[PDB]
């Protein structure tokens, strides 16, 4: 009976571990969430989460917190984007097993 946002809360510590996602993967995930329908992130949000000056882990933490707070649609789309751009990691998520 887990919702997509339940899954995301469950998966967040795993997803944010160093090495798990690369900058290229996180950047493409952000683009995926901004460039299509539904538009999960605004352009300004997308720029903030891609900002090369902040550590990837901090940006990723902040993105996942943002999606958790934004509801089921946003959490679901994150999982679709993760499948597209980081499939091996997507297959290993705690919430799958």
PDB file of N, CA and C in Angstrom:
ATOM      1  N   UNK A   1       0.834  -1.199   0.000  1.00  0.00           N
ATOM      2  CA  UNK A   1       0.000   0.000   0.000  1.00  0.00           C
ATOM      3  C   UNK A   1       0.870   1.252   0.000  1.00  0.00           C
ATOM      4  N   UNK A   2       2.167   1.071  -0.271  1.00  0.00           N
ATOM      5  CA  UNK A   2       3.083   2.207  -0.360  1.00  0.00           C
ATOM      6  C   UNK A   2       2.750   3.120  -1.542  1.00  0.00           C
ATOM      7  N   UNK A   3       2.631   4.412  -1.262  1.00  0.00           N
ATOM      8  CA  UNK A   3       2.550   5.412  -2.306  1.00  0.00           C
ATOM      9  C   UNK A   3       3.938   5.723  -2.861  1.00  0.00           C
ATOM     10  N   UNK A   4       3.971   6.461  -3.961  1.00  0.00           N
ATOM     11  CA  UNK A   4       5.233   6.849  -4.565  1.00  0.00           C
ATOM     12  C   UNK A   4       6.019   7.770  -3.644  1.00  0.00           C
ATOM     13  N   UNK A   5       5.334   8.588  -2.850  1.00  0.00           N
ATOM     14  CA  UNK A   5       6.066   9.454  -1.934  1.00  0.00           C
ATOM     15  C   UNK A   5       6.546   8.678  -0.702  1.00  0.00           C
ATOM     16  N   UNK A   6       5.830   7.621  -0.326  1.00  0.00           N
ATOM     17  CA  UNK A   6       6.321   6.695   0.712  1.00  0.00           C
ATOM     18  C   UNK A   6       7.605   6.041   0.233  1.00  0.00           C
ATOM     19  N   UNK A   7       7.614   5.604  -1.032  1.00  0.00           N
ATOM     20  CA  UNK A   7       8.778   4.974  -1.625  1.00  0.00           C
ATOM     21  C   UNK A   7       9.896   5.971  -1.595  1.00  0.00           C
ATOM     22  N   UNK A   8       9.605   7.217  -1.955  1.00  0.00           N
ATOM     23  CA  UNK A   8      10.708   8.194  -2.073  1.00  0.00           C
ATOM     24  C   UNK A   8      11.348   8.501  -0.717  1.00  0.00           C
ATOM     25  N   UNK A   9      10.504   8.667   0.304  1.00  0.00           N
ATOM     26  CA  UNK A   9      11.004   8.831   1.657  1.00  0.00           C
ATOM     27  C   UNK A   9      11.877   7.627   2.025  1.00  0.00           C
ATOM     28  N   UNK A  10      11.413   6.417   1.723  1.00  0.00           N
ATOM     29  CA  UNK A  10      12.156   5.212   2.039  1.00  0.00           C
ATOM     30  C   UNK A  10      13.523   5.151   1.338  1.00  0.00           C
ATOM     31  N   UNK A  11      13.533   5.585   0.088  1.00  0.00           N
ATOM     32  CA  UNK A  11      14.718   5.504  -0.774  1.00  0.00           C
ATOM     33  C   UNK A  11      15.707   6.640  -0.639  1.00  0.00           C
ATOM     34  N   UNK A  12      15.324   7.723   0.028  1.00  0.00           N
ATOM     35  CA  UNK A  12      16.144   8.931   0.042  1.00  0.00           C
ATOM     36  C   UNK A  12      17.570   8.720   0.595  1.00  0.00           C
ATOM     37  N   UNK A  13      17.706   8.004   1.729  1.00  0.00           N
ATOM     38  CA  UNK A  13      19.079   7.830   2.241  1.00  0.00           C
ATOM     39  C   UNK A  13      19.975   7.034   1.266  1.00  0.00           C
ATOM     40  N   UNK A  14      19.389   6.004   0.681  1.00  0.00           N
ATOM     41  CA  UNK A  14      20.081   5.213  -0.335  1.00  0.00           C
ATOM     42  C   UNK A  14      20.458   6.102  -1.551  1.00  0.00           C
ATOM     43  N   UNK A  15      19.491   6.845  -2.096  1.00  0.00           N
ATOM     44  CA  UNK A  15      19.747   7.660  -3.272  1.00  0.00           C
ATOM     45  C   UNK A  15      20.831   8.725  -3.088  1.00  0.00           C
ATOM     46  N   UNK A  16      20.975   9.228  -1.862  1.00  0.00           N
ATOM     47  CA  UNK A  16      21.865  10.341  -1.591  1.00  0.00           C
ATOM     48  C   UNK A  16      23.274   9.874  -1.161  1.00  0.00           C
ATOM     49  N   UNK A  17      23.471   8.579  -1.028  1.00  0.00           N
ATOM     50  CA  UNK A  17      24.805   8.073  -0.726  1.00  0.00           C
ATOM     51  C   UNK A  17      25.791   8.457  -1.815  1.00  0.00           C
ATOM     52  N   UNK A  18      26.998   8.878  -1.403  1.00  0.00           N
ATOM     53  CA  UNK A  18      27.995   9.309  -2.375  1.00  0.00           C
ATOM     54  C   UNK A  18      28.280   8.181  -3.324  1.00  0.00           C
ATOM     55  N   UNK A  19      28.370   8.509  -4.600  1.00  0.00           N
ATOM     56  CA  UNK A  19      28.646   7.531  -5.637  1.00  0.00           C
ATOM     57  C   UNK A  19      27.426   6.969  -6.333  1.00  0.00           C
ATOM     58  N   UNK A  20      26.264   7.074  -5.704  1.00  0.00           N
ATOM     59  CA  UNK A  20      25.073   6.395  -6.219  1.00  0.00           C
ATOM     60  C   UNK A  20      24.571   7.052  -7.489  1.00  0.00           C
ATOM     61  N   UNK A  21      24.487   8.386  -7.494  1.00  0.00           N
ATOM     62  CA  UNK A  21      24.124   9.123  -8.710  1.00  0.00           C
ATOM     63  C   UNK A  21      25.256  10.050  -9.091  1.00  0.00           C
ATOM     64  N   UNK A  22      25.516  10.156 -10.366  1.00  0.00           N
ATOM     65  CA  UNK A  22      26.545  11.096 -10.847  1.00  0.00           C
ATOM     66  C   UNK A  22      25.914  12.469 -11.146  1.00  0.00           C
ATOM     67  N   UNK A  23      26.739  13.490 -11.314  1.00  0.00           N
ATOM     68  CA  UNK A  23      26.238  14.781 -11.742  1.00  0.00           C
ATOM     69  C   UNK A  23      25.484  14.703 -13.080  1.00  0.00           C
ATOM     70  N   UNK A  24      26.004  13.971 -14.064  1.00  0.00           N
ATOM     71  CA  UNK A  24      25.329  13.880 -15.354  1.00  0.00           C
ATOM     72  C   UNK A  24      23.938  13.280 -15.142  1.00  0.00           C
ATOM     73  N   UNK A  25      23.831  12.263 -14.297  1.00  0.00           N
ATOM     74  CA  UNK A  25      22.528  11.616 -14.104  1.00  0.00           C
ATOM     75  C   UNK A  25      21.541  12.557 -13.419  1.00  0.00           C
ATOM     76  N   UNK A  26      21.978  13.221 -12.365  1.00  0.00           N
ATOM     77  CA  UNK A  26      21.117  14.140 -11.636  1.00  0.00           C
ATOM     78  C   UNK A  26      20.704  15.287 -12.577  1.00  0.00           C
ATOM     79  N   UNK A  27      21.642  15.791 -13.384  1.00  0.00           N
ATOM     80  CA  UNK A  27      21.284  16.884 -14.280  1.00  0.00           C
ATOM     81  C   UNK A  27      20.219  16.496 -15.296  1.00  0.00           C
ATOM     82  N   UNK A  28      20.307  15.287 -15.845  1.00  0.00           N
ATOM     83  CA  UNK A  28      19.347  14.804 -16.815  1.00  0.00           C
ATOM     84  C   UNK A  28      18.008  14.530 -16.153  1.00  0.00           C
ATOM     85  N   UNK A  29      18.044  14.060 -14.911  1.00  0.00           N
ATOM     86  CA  UNK A  29      16.805  13.878 -14.152  1.00  0.00           C
ATOM     87  C   UNK A  29      16.107  15.220 -13.945  1.00  0.00           C
ATOM     88  N   UNK A  30      16.861  16.243 -13.579  1.00  0.00           N
ATOM     89  CA  UNK A  30      16.271  17.558 -13.419  1.00  0.00           C
ATOM     90  C   UNK A  30      15.634  18.064 -14.730  1.00  0.00           C
ATOM     91  N   UNK A  31      16.347  17.910 -15.835  1.00  0.00           N
ATOM     92  CA  UNK A  31      15.815  18.291 -17.123  1.00  0.00           C
ATOM     93  C   UNK A  31      14.517  17.539 -17.449  1.00  0.00           C
ATOM     94  N   UNK A  32      14.516  16.240 -17.184  1.00  0.00           N
ATOM     95  CA  UNK A  32      13.342  15.429 -17.401  1.00  0.00           C
ATOM     96  C   UNK A  32      12.146  15.974 -16.636  1.00  0.00           C
ATOM     97  N   UNK A  33      12.378  16.461 -15.417  1.00  0.00           N
ATOM     98  CA  UNK A  33      11.312  16.974 -14.569  1.00  0.00           C
ATOM     99  C   UNK A  33      10.870  18.402 -14.933  1.00  0.00           C
ATOM    100  N   UNK A  34      11.612  19.072 -15.791  1.00  0.00           N
ATOM    101  CA  UNK A  34      11.313  20.439 -16.127  1.00  0.00           C
ATOM    102  C   UNK A  34      10.813  20.567 -17.557  1.00  0.00           C
ATOM    103  N   UNK A  35      11.285  19.706 -18.451  1.00  0.00           N
ATOM    104  CA  UNK A  35      11.083  19.922 -19.883  1.00  0.00           C
ATOM    105  C   UNK A  35       9.822  19.286 -20.479  1.00  0.00           C
ATOM    106  N   UNK A  36       9.095  18.480 -19.708  1.00  0.00           N
ATOM    107  CA  UNK A  36       7.971  17.715 -20.251  1.00  0.00           C
ATOM    108  C   UNK A  36       6.687  17.995 -19.465  1.00  0.00           C
ATOM    109  N   UNK A  37       5.653  17.203 -19.718  1.00  0.00           N
ATOM    110  CA  UNK A  37       4.371  17.311 -19.043  1.00  0.00           C
ATOM    111  C   UNK A  37       4.181  16.020 -18.268  1.00  0.00           C
ATOM    112  N   UNK A  38       3.854  16.126 -16.977  1.00  0.00           N
ATOM    113  CA  UNK A  38       3.663  17.351 -16.209  1.00  0.00           C
ATOM    114  C   UNK A  38       5.021  17.979 -15.951  1.00  0.00           C
ATOM    115  N   UNK A  39       5.014  19.291 -15.796  1.00  0.00           N
ATOM    116  CA  UNK A  39       6.213  20.023 -15.476  1.00  0.00           C
ATOM    117  C   UNK A  39       6.331  20.060 -13.985  1.00  0.00           C
ATOM    118  N   UNK A  40       7.282  19.300 -13.471  1.00  0.00           N
ATOM    119  CA  UNK A  40       7.428  19.155 -12.039  1.00  0.00           C
ATOM    120  C   UNK A  40       8.256  20.278 -11.465  1.00  0.00           C
ATOM    121  N   UNK A  41       9.305  20.694 -12.174  1.00  0.00           N
ATOM    122  CA  UNK A  41      10.178  21.769 -11.700  1.00  0.00           C
ATOM    123  C   UNK A  41      10.055  22.957 -12.627  1.00  0.00           C
ATOM    124  N   UNK A  42       9.971  24.152 -12.063  1.00  0.00           N
ATOM    125  CA  UNK A  42      10.083  25.357 -12.882  1.00  0.00           C
ATOM    126  C   UNK A  42      11.480  25.546 -13.435  1.00  0.00           C
ATOM    127  N   UNK A  43      11.637  26.453 -14.388  1.00  0.00           N
ATOM    128  CA  UNK A  43      12.958  26.713 -14.942  1.00  0.00           C
ATOM    129  C   UNK A  43      13.907  27.193 -13.860  1.00  0.00           C
ATOM    130  N   UNK A  44      13.432  28.078 -12.981  1.00  0.00           N
ATOM    131  CA  UNK A  44      14.266  28.588 -11.912  1.00  0.00           C
ATOM    132  C   UNK A  44      14.665  27.474 -10.943  1.00  0.00           C
ATOM    133  N   UNK A  45      13.742  26.571 -10.629  1.00  0.00           N
ATOM    134  CA  UNK A  45      14.065  25.418  -9.808  1.00  0.00           C
ATOM    135  C   UNK A  45      15.089  24.502 -10.436  1.00  0.00           C
ATOM    136  N   UNK A  46      14.911  24.218 -11.718  1.00  0.00           N
ATOM    137  CA  UNK A  46      15.848  23.394 -12.432  1.00  0.00           C
ATOM    138  C   UNK A  46      17.248  24.010 -12.391  1.00  0.00           C
ATOM    139  N   UNK A  47      17.340  25.327 -12.522  1.00  0.00           N
ATOM    140  CA  UNK A  47      18.675  25.967 -12.519  1.00  0.00           C
ATOM    141  C   UNK A  47      19.325  25.857 -11.154  1.00  0.00           C
ATOM    142  N   UNK A  48      18.508  26.000 -10.123  1.00  0.00           N
ATOM    143  CA  UNK A  48      18.986  25.901  -8.759  1.00  0.00           C
ATOM    144  C   UNK A  48      19.534  24.487  -8.467  1.00  0.00           C
ATOM    145  N   UNK A  49      18.840  23.454  -8.908  1.00  0.00           N
ATOM    146  CA  UNK A  49      19.309  22.106  -8.635  1.00  0.00           C
ATOM    147  C   UNK A  49      20.459  21.629  -9.518  1.00  0.00           C
ATOM    148  N   UNK A  50      20.760  22.382 -10.579  1.00  0.00           N
ATOM    149  CA  UNK A  50      21.877  22.063 -11.482  1.00  0.00           C
ATOM    150  C   UNK A  50      23.116  22.904 -11.167  1.00  0.00           C
ATOM    151  N   UNK A  51      22.983  23.797 -10.204  1.00  0.00           N
ATOM    152  CA  UNK A  51      23.987  24.815  -9.933  1.00  0.00           C
ATOM    153  C   UNK A  51      25.356  24.216  -9.590  1.00  0.00           C
ATOM    154  N   UNK A  52      26.345  24.387 -10.496  1.00  0.00           N
ATOM    155  CA  UNK A  52      27.593  23.639 -10.295  1.00  0.00           C
ATOM    156  C   UNK A  52      28.332  24.027  -9.017  1.00  0.00           C
ATOM    157  N   UNK A  53      27.959  25.147  -8.405  1.00  0.00           N
ATOM    158  CA  UNK A  53      28.715  25.679  -7.269  1.00  0.00           C
ATOM    159  C   UNK A  53      28.382  24.982  -5.954  1.00  0.00           C
ATOM    160  N   UNK A  54      27.184  24.414  -5.857  1.00  0.00           N
ATOM    161  CA  UNK A  54      26.767  23.646  -4.668  1.00  0.00           C
ATOM    162  C   UNK A  54      27.084  22.136  -4.834  1.00  0.00           C
ATOM    163  N   UNK A  55      27.416  21.457  -3.750  1.00  0.00           N
ATOM    164  CA  UNK A  55      27.705  20.033  -3.816  1.00  0.00           C
ATOM    165  C   UNK A  55      26.491  19.273  -4.350  1.00  0.00           C
ATOM    166  N   UNK A  56      26.784  18.266  -5.162  1.00  0.00           N
ATOM    167  CA  UNK A  56      25.767  17.409  -5.728  1.00  0.00           C
ATOM    168  C   UNK A  56      24.878  16.808  -4.633  1.00  0.00           C
ATOM    169  N   UNK A  57      25.464  16.262  -3.578  1.00  0.00           N
ATOM    170  CA  UNK A  57      24.695  15.634  -2.514  1.00  0.00           C
ATOM    171  C   UNK A  57      23.696  16.601  -1.879  1.00  0.00           C
ATOM    172  N   UNK A  58      24.101  17.848  -1.661  1.00  0.00           N
ATOM    173  CA  UNK A  58      23.210  18.849  -1.069  1.00  0.00           C
ATOM    174  C   UNK A  58      22.045  19.158  -2.002  1.00  0.00           C
ATOM    175  N   UNK A  59      22.352  19.385  -3.285  1.00  0.00           N
ATOM    176  CA  UNK A  59      21.347  19.647  -4.319  1.00  0.00           C
ATOM    177  C   UNK A  59      20.383  18.489  -4.443  1.00  0.00           C
ATOM    178  N   UNK A  60      20.918  17.273  -4.456  1.00  0.00           N
ATOM    179  CA  UNK A  60      20.087  16.093  -4.573  1.00  0.00           C
ATOM    180  C   UNK A  60      19.189  15.937  -3.357  1.00  0.00           C
ATOM    181  N   UNK A  61      19.732  16.201  -2.153  1.00  0.00           N
ATOM    182  CA  UNK A  61      18.949  16.159  -0.913  1.00  0.00           C
ATOM    183  C   UNK A  61      17.791  17.148  -1.006  1.00  0.00           C
ATOM    184  N   UNK A  62      18.115  18.361  -1.426  1.00  0.00           N
ATOM    185  CA  UNK A  62      17.137  19.409  -1.545  1.00  0.00           C
ATOM    186  C   UNK A  62      16.068  19.064  -2.606  1.00  0.00           C
ATOM    187  N   UNK A  63      16.476  18.508  -3.746  1.00  0.00           N
ATOM    188  CA  UNK A  63      15.495  18.059  -4.732  1.00  0.00           C
ATOM    189  C   UNK A  63      14.566  16.983  -4.207  1.00  0.00           C
ATOM    190  N   UNK A  64      15.132  15.964  -3.560  1.00  0.00           N
ATOM    191  CA  UNK A  64      14.297  14.925  -3.008  1.00  0.00           C
ATOM    192  C   UNK A  64      13.379  15.440  -1.911  1.00  0.00           C
ATOM    193  N   UNK A  65      13.826  16.377  -1.080  1.00  0.00           N
ATOM    194  CA  UNK A  65      12.925  16.990  -0.091  1.00  0.00           C
ATOM    195  C   UNK A  65      11.797  17.754  -0.747  1.00  0.00           C
ATOM    196  N   UNK A  66      12.129  18.487  -1.805  1.00  0.00           N
ATOM    197  CA  UNK A  66      11.156  19.225  -2.555  1.00  0.00           C
ATOM    198  C   UNK A  66      10.094  18.299  -3.160  1.00  0.00           C
ATOM    199  N   UNK A  67      10.509  17.177  -3.753  1.00  0.00           N
ATOM    200  CA  UNK A  67       9.542  16.287  -4.354  1.00  0.00           C
ATOM    201  C   UNK A  67       8.661  15.612  -3.320  1.00  0.00           C
ATOM    202  N   UNK A  68       9.268  15.205  -2.208  1.00  0.00           N
ATOM    203  CA  UNK A  68       8.497  14.613  -1.108  1.00  0.00           C
ATOM    204  C   UNK A  68       7.381  15.516  -0.631  1.00  0.00           C
ATOM    205  N   UNK A  69       7.632  16.821  -0.630  1.00  0.00           N
ATOM    206  CA  UNK A  69       6.682  17.780  -0.086  1.00  0.00           C
ATOM    207  C   UNK A  69       5.613  18.168  -1.133  1.00  0.00           C
ATOM    208  N   UNK A  70       5.860  17.807  -2.393  1.00  0.00           N
ATOM    209  CA  UNK A  70       5.040  18.290  -3.507  1.00  0.00           C
ATOM    210  C   UNK A  70       3.959  17.292  -3.976  1.00  0.00           C
ATOM    211  N   UNK A  71       3.967  16.100  -3.405  1.00  0.00           N
ATOM    212  CA  UNK A  71       2.913  15.137  -3.617  1.00  0.00           C
ATOM    213  C   UNK A  71       3.170  13.999  -4.595  1.00  0.00           C
ATOM    214  N   UNK A  72       2.186  13.106  -4.666  1.00  0.00           N
ATOM    215  CA  UNK A  72       2.304  11.834  -5.358  1.00  0.00           C
ATOM    216  C   UNK A  72       2.723  11.929  -6.833  1.00  0.00           C
ATOM    217  N   UNK A  73       2.170  12.888  -7.559  1.00  0.00           N
ATOM    218  CA  UNK A  73       2.537  13.093  -8.963  1.00  0.00           C
ATOM    219  C   UNK A  73       4.024  13.342  -9.107  1.00  0.00           C
ATOM    220  N   UNK A  74       4.551  14.219  -8.272  1.00  0.00           N
ATOM    221  CA  UNK A  74       5.952  14.610  -8.373  1.00  0.00           C
ATOM    222  C   UNK A  74       6.880  13.430  -8.009  1.00  0.00           C
ATOM    223  N   UNK A  75       6.515  12.684  -6.978  1.00  0.00           N
ATOM    224  CA  UNK A  75       7.277  11.504  -6.598  1.00  0.00           C
ATOM    225  C   UNK A  75       7.272  10.431  -7.695  1.00  0.00           C
ATOM    226  N   UNK A  76       6.111  10.180  -8.287  1.00  0.00           N
ATOM    227  CA  UNK A  76       5.995   9.219  -9.375  1.00  0.00           C
ATOM    228  C   UNK A  76       6.872   9.596 -10.579  1.00  0.00           C
ATOM    229  N   UNK A  77       6.869  10.873 -10.928  1.00  0.00           N
ATOM    230  CA  UNK A  77       7.642  11.306 -12.076  1.00  0.00           C
ATOM    231  C   UNK A  77       9.126  11.192 -11.803  1.00  0.00           C
ATOM    232  N   UNK A  78       9.532  11.382 -10.543  1.00  0.00           N
ATOM    233  CA  UNK A  78      10.932  11.163 -10.208  1.00  0.00           C
ATOM    234  C   UNK A  78      11.365   9.741 -10.522  1.00  0.00           C
ATOM    235  N   UNK A  79      10.533   8.757 -10.189  1.00  0.00           N
ATOM    236  CA  UNK A  79      10.875   7.358 -10.452  1.00  0.00           C
ATOM    237  C   UNK A  79      10.959   7.086 -11.962  1.00  0.00           C
ATOM    238  N   UNK A  80      10.050   7.690 -12.749  1.00  0.00           N
ATOM    239  CA  UNK A  80      10.146   7.535 -14.207  1.00  0.00           C
ATOM    240  C   UNK A  80      11.482   8.121 -14.704  1.00  0.00           C
ATOM    241  N   UNK A  81      11.838   9.295 -14.207  1.00  0.00           N
ATOM    242  CA  UNK A  81      13.079   9.918 -14.647  1.00  0.00           C
ATOM    243  C   UNK A  81      14.311   9.120 -14.263  1.00  0.00           C
ATOM    244  N   UNK A  82      14.314   8.595 -13.051  1.00  0.00           N
ATOM    245  CA  UNK A  82      15.398   7.717 -12.593  1.00  0.00           C
ATOM    246  C   UNK A  82      15.522   6.471 -13.455  1.00  0.00           C
ATOM    247  N   UNK A  83      14.387   5.889 -13.870  1.00  0.00           N
ATOM    248  CA  UNK A  83      14.484   4.766 -14.806  1.00  0.00           C
ATOM    249  C   UNK A  83      15.135   5.163 -16.126  1.00  0.00           C
ATOM    250  N   UNK A  84      14.723   6.294 -16.660  1.00  0.00           N
ATOM    251  CA  UNK A  84      15.294   6.762 -17.923  1.00  0.00           C
ATOM    252  C   UNK A  84      16.799   7.010 -17.827  1.00  0.00           C
ATOM    253  N   UNK A  85      17.245   7.696 -16.784  1.00  0.00           N
ATOM    254  CA  UNK A  85      18.626   8.179 -16.736  1.00  0.00           C
ATOM    255  C   UNK A  85      19.589   7.448 -15.801  1.00  0.00           C
ATOM    256  N   UNK A  86      19.091   6.541 -14.989  1.00  0.00           N
ATOM    257  CA  UNK A  86      19.939   5.787 -14.052  1.00  0.00           C
ATOM    258  C   UNK A  86      19.325   4.437 -13.766  1.00  0.00           C
ATOM    259  N   UNK A  87      19.070   3.669 -14.826  1.00  0.00           N
ATOM    260  CA  UNK A  87      18.313   2.418 -14.678  1.00  0.00           C
ATOM    261  C   UNK A  87      18.941   1.393 -13.702  1.00  0.00           C
ATOM    262  N   UNK A  88      20.263   1.221 -13.721  1.00  0.00           N
ATOM    263  CA  UNK A  88      20.828   0.234 -12.799  1.00  0.00           C
ATOM    264  C   UNK A  88      20.551   0.592 -11.336  1.00  0.00           C
ATOM    265  N   UNK A  89      20.664   1.872 -11.012  1.00  0.00           N
ATOM    266  CA  UNK A  89      20.331   2.314  -9.657  1.00  0.00           C
ATOM    267  C   UNK A  89      18.839   2.146  -9.371  1.00  0.00           C
ATOM    268  N   UNK A  90      18.005   2.524 -10.353  1.00  0.00           N
ATOM    269  CA  UNK A  90      16.581   2.386 -10.198  1.00  0.00           C
ATOM    270  C   UNK A  90      16.218   0.919  -9.841  1.00  0.00           C
ATOM    271  N   UNK A  91      16.874  -0.033 -10.462  1.00  0.00           N
ATOM    272  CA  UNK A  91      16.599  -1.457 -10.212  1.00  0.00           C
ATOM    273  C   UNK A  91      17.002  -1.927  -8.836  1.00  0.00           C
ATOM    274  N   UNK A  92      17.853  -1.164  -8.162  1.00  0.00           N
ATOM    275  CA  UNK A  92      18.372  -1.566  -6.853  1.00  0.00           C
ATOM    276  C   UNK A  92      17.713  -0.871  -5.665  1.00  0.00           C
ATOM    277  N   UNK A  93      16.728  -0.002  -5.897  1.00  0.00           N
ATOM    278  CA  UNK A  93      16.148   0.759  -4.784  1.00  0.00           C
ATOM    279  C   UNK A  93      15.535  -0.111  -3.698  1.00  0.00           C
ATOM    280  N   UNK A  94      15.762   0.267  -2.429  1.00  0.00           N
ATOM    281  CA  UNK A  94      15.133  -0.420  -1.298  1.00  0.00           C
ATOM    282  C   UNK A  94      13.636  -0.604  -1.497  1.00  0.00           C
ATOM    283  N   UNK A  95      12.932   0.393  -2.047  1.00  0.00           N
ATOM    284  CA  UNK A  95      11.472   0.331  -2.140  1.00  0.00           C
ATOM    285  C   UNK A  95      10.988  -0.714  -3.133  1.00  0.00           C
ATOM    286  N   UNK A  96      11.888  -1.228  -3.955  1.00  0.00           N
ATOM    287  CA  UNK A  96      11.508  -2.269  -4.908  1.00  0.00           C
ATOM    288  C   UNK A  96      11.501  -3.621  -4.209  1.00  0.00           C
ATOM    289  N   UNK A  97      12.342  -3.776  -3.179  1.00  0.00           N
ATOM    290  CA  UNK A  97      12.621  -5.085  -2.597  1.00  0.00           C
ATOM    291  C   UNK A  97      12.156  -5.165  -1.147  1.00  0.00           C
TER     292      UNK A  97
END
